[PDB]
């Protein structure tokens, strides 16, 4: 019932709805699978890189400010608990 | 002197100074040993 | 469909080991994350950059299918060679053991004697050889040498 | 930082300026235009007026190409991050 | 009724502050002595990461079936103590101090009171 | 006195201009130009209350004009990230207090 | 005389090793260690030697006592670098899992304490599960972990 | 929410009472050394000079 | 640290390392000289006692080994420098042969000169 | 971030450079480390394990709250099987710490005489004495100086007077009474600190 409890919410989303739904499942799976936050960032980048070819930069922290140059429609912003799963593919 | 021909000659002079000093200590050690024996006697 | 190809088995087997290790799920497919799972479990490489480097060089990649197995098949071939050097005693022994081994004698003692200003010029050397010769065979083998030196 | 470049131009034959012009034109054109397509057009136009026509130059950050060029008319150099290739054929 | 529990927590000796966290991570109520909301936002994120990692680790890393952590107490330098208890979907952090720490706090409070009295006396003198 | 007298609250209050570098992967000459610009820009846009978005917008615009068209820098109190960058294009320096700054060139 | 000479040499060696020890009682673990390091020319004998491999009862003695204490599953020391200095559990799998999983939680737990106050450092951490209580004492050089079933 | 907080606090309060009974981390005579310690006067012949 | 100069003695790449071994030996022999000033108490040389020490003999062997290791590090850059340089070996005998090989092409002259500029 | 910031502050101001040089314990095998910072953690761990088992007793001790009636409840008993022959005799409490109390075992009945062990029992750990002292004869009386907790007065058979310092690691008597010091004969039943 932990998956129901997390209720991850995407504050800002710039991606197709079908792709966005897939990201939520990966984000929930990554948090339980990874013992530490640093492991979560590596797991999200590896899964997305395998799923979609390109260069992916992912940063997750309790408090942070980010300005980035990402390919249009490849940036999805979702916040679960105190962790921000942010991925932006840059060509 | 941890810290060519010139280095060797300089080292030899440094070694010679230590050798001159060490010899003085040997006389002192022998006198100290004799003094301990003399006190017991 | 093989066609008379011996090839190595040690490596060919390793791949299957690590493969079934993570593929144990029996999903029939392979993802880009699974390939790293192995190296992530044992800790083969420092970062995914390594495995990703060689793999990426292979040709291309995607999300997940099954061909990913190539990662392991090629992984074994990126192990390459090791070599390092341990201890400084063994070298000293070899400096005296000109037949490129512990065995033979007195000839190495005479080599030391050439331009030797050491005390007991030859009697001391003979005494040292005798001390280093525990089993009385007139020679100092590597085990005797080590015991002698330590 | 343009560690390795290929230079195939005449030296002390009074055509020494062609090598100098290519390096100078590439630096000035690349910074102002800031476009891969625009850099090729500007470099080709300046070279065409000074040394005549039939000059082809292609600018790409990363690319692989094989071409036939007139001897001593082909120069390959890197302007900052960008790589510019210019040669004369025909 | 709910307000009285916060007053009761303060009443217990050696208690500095109490913070309550929702499943989402929002801090329901925090003590006034401790920073309100800014500290609660920073404390809720750390406890959730710790509580979730510890709960997940006990079930899989220790290989024990149906084993769940009930209370986590972290004793650090000086008088800091941070007992964590989870009830239903809400988990809270309680900061209590040792006897020496409590005595020091009392002394500090007394000093502050003395300073206030001195300031009042100075004001009276100025008025005179 | 000295270190014993100093406290974490006291240390932050005592010095706000202290600069600490944790990770360096960019050429030193390039780092000197970047370090002066980021420190000056953050203080100017700090305002009454520091804004993470405000600091990043000023830094992103200055860096793009200064070196390359696509430059990404992220600053947060605490974060975990995996980033793929070009050789000698990433500089990591955190300001005194709870301020972590990451700047890289893509 | 060769044998005599050898004996003399041995005696000399013995004297050097002693110095601080000054013969008398077998005494001290630290002294023994120092002798072994610096000079390895001679070893053993000399005096009674007390109990073999028991330089100091007090840290070693206290650890033995807590393990002997009732309702304690065991006490495993974790090396600063994810290693088992000493393991005392009935099953290797529980000890192996505890050896790797417990230090990672403590390091994560130490940071949680560390974020609130930088000066404050973890002194002791205790996690109580539904069926068992886990107590971990963390130091930079070594970490002590004890699992005691709740009474 | 109301029931959980009293109950949660109650549990927090129970933890507070057990720790309050004894410090449990105090070290008797921590830091201070032996202080006064009897010292025997001693004499050491450094050397002997004789004709 | 030990300093050495790398040049071409007789046109052969060589540093001033056998001489270094001889120079260090003099320092080693000087240490032995210091051990012979005690006069063996009595009314007598302590140099023989040092010889009688197996450990002292072992220490002398270690010093010789260290010199060989330093030379090996020097040989890498010495060898690496020679490899690029070797493509341009000693004497003009090859040049006379090389000049004839060039022959007719005018550009041919420029390419060799360009390589020399790179060598410069 | 603070750690990097802190190290720089220490570099700025080179006053009282941190000691605790890393000579450590070493020795490779057969008993590396296991000694002073680690010893404190082990001591804390032993009390915590004891605290969980004695939690029911500890909770009652802190506040069980026990008309002219009196109720007395024994809480814990501290004893040694080896020291069973020894009698409790003199008992004292350190002035500085209420928790630390020292009882010096002595042998009564006169005809039977055995060595007496002085044990200081801290309230935190009741399994074994915090400090153990071995004496040639049973200790008739033990007292603690009011000004300094470390100073301890010990009285034993043959009138020997022993002064012990808790701080000293060696645990040998700081002072002793001899025939030249005019030590009294028989047994010193009562000893006190001025």
mmCIF file of C-alpha atoms in Angstrom, chain E residues 17-67:
data_model
loop_
_atom_site.group_PDB
_atom_site.id
_atom_site.type_symbol
_atom_site.label_atom_id
_atom_site.label_comp_id
_atom_site.label_asym_id
_atom_site.label_seq_id
_atom_site.Cartn_x
_atom_site.Cartn_y
_atom_site.Cartn_z
ATOM 1 C CA UNK E 17 10.094 20.453 20.442
ATOM 2 C CA UNK E 18 7.681 18.095 18.608
ATOM 3 C CA UNK E 19 7.250 17.835 14.778
ATOM 4 C CA UNK E 20 4.459 15.795 13.055
ATOM 5 C CA UNK E 21 4.795 14.530 9.428
ATOM 6 C CA UNK E 22 1.977 13.428 7.036
ATOM 7 C CA UNK E 23 2.462 10.592 4.459
ATOM 8 C CA UNK E 24 2.969 13.331 1.764
ATOM 9 C CA UNK E 25 5.642 14.974 3.997
ATOM 10 C CA UNK E 26 3.753 18.183 4.950
ATOM 11 C CA UNK E 27 4.448 19.125 8.638
ATOM 12 C CA UNK E 28 1.049 19.211 10.454
ATOM 13 C CA UNK E 29 2.139 20.926 13.739
ATOM 14 C CA UNK E 30 5.588 21.994 15.080
ATOM 15 C CA UNK E 31 6.782 23.564 18.395
ATOM 16 C CA UNK E 32 7.101 27.406 18.656
ATOM 17 C CA UNK E 33 10.583 27.283 20.311
ATOM 18 C CA UNK E 34 11.931 25.413 17.220
ATOM 19 C CA UNK E 35 11.668 27.101 13.764
ATOM 20 C CA UNK E 36 8.094 26.692 12.383
ATOM 21 C CA UNK E 37 7.559 25.394 8.762
ATOM 22 C CA UNK E 38 11.100 26.184 7.445
ATOM 23 C CA UNK E 39 12.664 23.753 9.995
ATOM 24 C CA UNK E 40 9.616 21.420 9.677
ATOM 25 C CA UNK E 41 10.031 21.280 5.849
ATOM 26 C CA UNK E 42 13.764 20.482 6.359
ATOM 27 C CA UNK E 43 13.104 17.968 9.209
ATOM 28 C CA UNK E 44 10.221 16.154 7.399
ATOM 29 C CA UNK E 45 12.356 15.481 4.279
ATOM 30 C CA UNK E 46 15.255 13.962 6.327
ATOM 31 C CA UNK E 47 13.016 11.776 8.597
ATOM 32 C CA UNK E 48 10.984 10.407 5.621
ATOM 33 C CA UNK E 49 14.225 9.398 3.795
ATOM 34 C CA UNK E 50 15.546 7.786 7.037
ATOM 35 C CA UNK E 51 12.233 6.147 8.109
ATOM 36 C CA UNK E 52 11.518 4.855 4.553
ATOM 37 C CA UNK E 53 15.114 3.544 4.093
ATOM 38 C CA UNK E 54 15.105 1.871 7.564
ATOM 39 C CA UNK E 55 11.607 0.354 7.051
ATOM 40 C CA UNK E 56 12.635 -0.959 3.583
ATOM 41 C CA UNK E 57 16.081 -2.183 4.835
ATOM 42 C CA UNK E 58 14.668 -4.192 7.805
ATOM 43 C CA UNK E 59 12.239 -6.152 5.544
ATOM 44 C CA UNK E 60 14.787 -6.973 2.761
ATOM 45 C CA UNK E 61 18.402 -6.199 3.894
ATOM 46 C CA UNK E 62 18.050 -8.120 7.224
ATOM 47 C CA UNK E 63 16.048 -10.881 5.392
ATOM 48 C CA UNK E 64 13.389 -10.937 8.181
ATOM 49 C CA UNK E 65 9.735 -11.439 7.030
ATOM 50 C CA UNK E 66 6.978 -9.228 8.579
ATOM 51 C CA UNK E 67 9.458 -7.183 10.700
#
